[PDB]
């Protein structure tokens, strides 16, 4: 652990819960502005203190504080870095983290509940100790071809990893942080989410929209506020639905990659859209999108 | 395809036999079979249900709480691990972690 670090080059599980490393806070801002639905926050930590690395795509431990409510030590709660490699800052000091505060009514006594961990983030306070556990990720890697076509498709806190992705690509900072990577491909973000205020990060992403019409196209998804022709509130997978055709051409391609992210059961209707629309073409999604795993072309992340 | 999936348990001793399809995951298959499994976030997000493979396969790709390393020795996650083969395996297995 700590010490361990001795083969390959992607910083992977560089620290251990039997070796936190008690990160501090720097901000914690909102993302979700008056009429949005729940509670989301940018938090970002201060790395200074021990040798913390990462990438883009890696997820990043959190540890939180308590040894009474049962009985054992509190566990692992890992949380997709929302940050590229050198931190939010555009130098390596620092890391951002995009933590959904969990509530629910209790299955039985219907009392609202709140997971330890994110409701500890969410309200949590600058220059608060974190203990951080080493990155713990490989399987949404960034390639590192600017030719390369970055399909996203995420749903709420699953923007993490495509922020990671689209700063990286199309921060002005970055791009000199990284001269040799100067993205000049193709990407695009299936963005979904309950309502424009809900919209997280927007008026970064879209940002980088203006400026980069050739390189990155930007489709929201507003189930609260947009309808398909059909007469349905406007889901993800409504949406790639819709660009079924064009997103499955794109993924035909020979290095076009796909990265989805956000809560489980977001990937059943999206396998259905390409499993239609390629069908038409006469081929098994299922059987096709079986291989793309194999060569690496499909990231799937949701929890 | 649908493969057997033999549980077993370092303690009671159990080398209880179970038969999964090709599209579920090892947890809801023998779970609903007769075997109540321990889990939580059944998300792929937690350690509550990991698995220490014997001899098999199964499908990680849907994970990302998930060490190359501790992948490296065969340890699975029985709520979201689908049979890429015959598999035996040994549940109650969170402890070896952390
Ligand atoms: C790879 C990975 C990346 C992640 N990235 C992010 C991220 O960037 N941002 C983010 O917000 N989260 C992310 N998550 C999820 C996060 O790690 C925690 O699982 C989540 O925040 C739960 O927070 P908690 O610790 O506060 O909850 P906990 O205290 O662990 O409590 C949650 C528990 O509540 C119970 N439960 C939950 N809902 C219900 C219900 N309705 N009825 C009955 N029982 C229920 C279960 O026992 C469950 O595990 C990610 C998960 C993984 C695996
Ligand atoms: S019950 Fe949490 S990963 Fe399986």
Redesign the pocket.
């Known amino acids: 652990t700590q010490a361990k670090a001795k083969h390959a080059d992607v910083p992977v599980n560089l620290y251990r819960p039997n070796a936190p490393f008690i990160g501090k806070v720097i901000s914690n801002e909102p993302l979700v502005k008056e009429g949005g639905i729940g509670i989301v926050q940018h938090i970002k930590f201060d790395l200074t203190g021990g040798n913390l690395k990462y990438i883009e795509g890696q997820?990043i431990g959190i540890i939180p504080p308590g040894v009474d409510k049962n009985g054992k030590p509190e566990k692992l709660?890992?949380?997709?870095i929302?940050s590229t490699r050198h931190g939010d800052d555009v130098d390596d000091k620092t890391i951002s983290?995009?933590?959904?505060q969990?509530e629910?009514k209790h299955?039985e006594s219907g009392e609202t509940?709140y997971?330890?961990?994110?409701?500890y983030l969410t309200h949590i306070e600058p220059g608060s100790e974190v203990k951080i556990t080493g990155p713990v990720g490989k399987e949404m890697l960034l390639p590192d071809d600017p030719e390369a076509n970055v399909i996203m498709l995420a749903t709420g806190?699953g923007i993490?990893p495509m922020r990671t992705y689209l700063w990286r690509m199309f921060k002005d900072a970055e791009r000199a942080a990284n001269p040799e990577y100067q993205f000049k491909g193709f990407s695009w973000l299936v963005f979904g989410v309950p309502t424009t205020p809900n919209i997280l990060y927007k008026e970064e992403l879209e940002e980088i929209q203006q400026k980069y019409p050739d390189n990155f196209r930007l489709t929201y998804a507003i189930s609260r506020e947009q309808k398909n022709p059909q007469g349905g509130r406007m889901y993800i997978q409504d949406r790639v639905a819709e660009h079924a055709d064009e997103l499955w051409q794109l993924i035909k391609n020979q290095k076009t990659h796909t990265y989805i992210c956000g809560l489980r059961g977001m990937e059943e209707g999206i396998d259905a859209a390409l499993s239609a629309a390629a069908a038409k073409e006469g081929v098994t999604w299922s059987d096709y999108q079986k291989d793309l795993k194999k060569a690496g072309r499909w990231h799937v992340?949701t929890? | 395809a649908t493969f057997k999936v033999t549980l077993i348990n370092e303690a009671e001793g159990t080398k209880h036999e179970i038969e999964v399809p090709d599209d579920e995951y090892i947890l809801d298959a023998a779970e609903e079979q007769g075997y109540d499994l321990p889990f939580?976030?059944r998300?792929?997000?937690?350690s509550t249900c990991a698995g220490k493979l014997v001899s098999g396969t199964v499908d990680q790709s849907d994970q990302?709480?998930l060490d190359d390393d501790q992948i490296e020795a065969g340890y699975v996650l029985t709520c979201v691990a689908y049979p890429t083969s015959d598999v035996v395996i040994q549940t109650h297995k969170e402890e070896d972690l952390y």
């Open positions: 997820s709660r890992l949380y997709s929302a983290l995009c933590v959904r969990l629910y299955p509940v997971g330890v961990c994110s409701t806190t993490a992340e929890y | 939580s976030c998300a792929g997000a937690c990302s709480f």
